[PDB]
């Protein structure tokens, strides 16, 4: 996997995580 | 040149900088964070006694192939569960379920030995008597 793609994936994951956190709040 | 300050009154900078750098040295970090006490199944100790849950054969890593004969132990001091390798050819049939066992480290300072994956500990003594002694037939296992 390209590093850039990995980074992108991570970012995507983090968005979801953020959303989850917001929901929890 | 040279990245460091040199001046006769620098001292403090040299000290603080050195301190900062020290944290990249893994052993030092371990010592200072105290990961030997907080993490690690042995509480920063050379040996630990545990009670045998079950006997588990573990398949070795590559180039090699052989079922290794390890034991799932729960330590007395904290209650943490660990895998422990039982050395020598017989020896696995000296252990049995619900038996008190003395475990040492493997000899890699926390790291796994050889080809046995996820195993960090030896078995030294079963029910108060040395495994080696049993193996050589110098003493007998005094039941459980």
């Amino acid at each position: 996997m390209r590093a850039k793609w990995r980074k992108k994936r991570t970012r995507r994951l983090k968005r979801k995580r953020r959303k989850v956190r917001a929901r929890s709040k | 040149g040279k990245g460091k300050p040199r001046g006769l009154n620098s001292a403090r900078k040299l000290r603080v900088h050195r301190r900062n750098n020290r944290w990249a040295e893994t052993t030092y970090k371990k010592r200072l964070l105290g990961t030997a006490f907080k993490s690690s199944p042995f509480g920063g100790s050379s040996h630990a006694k545990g009670i045998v849950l079950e006997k588990i054969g573990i398949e070795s890593k590559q180039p090699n192939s052989a079922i290794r004969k390890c034991v799932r132990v729960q330590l007395i001091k904290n209650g943490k569960k660990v895998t422990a390798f039982v050395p020598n050819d017989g020896c696995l049939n000296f252990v049995d379920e619900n038996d008190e066992v003395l475990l040492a480290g493997f000899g890699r300072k926390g790291k796994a030995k050889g080809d046995i994956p996820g195993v960090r500990f030896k078995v030294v003594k079963v029910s108060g008597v040395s495994l080696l002694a049993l193996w050589k037939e110098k003493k007998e296992k005094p039941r459980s």
């Binding site: - | 054969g57 004969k69 050819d89 017989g90 696995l92 049939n93």
Partner: protein, 53 residues
Amino acid sequence: ARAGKVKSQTPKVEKQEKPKQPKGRAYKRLLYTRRFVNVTLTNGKRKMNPSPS
């Protein structure tokens, strides 16, 4: 049982009752004699434990 099979298999051969080695200073003396006094059968590269075959 999977475990400890090889040992079980092996023929129980007993140790030969030998003349005892002279332990201590005597042993050292013996060693010295074997090596630097006698200098017995030297190939150039001087061997310690040669195979009998």
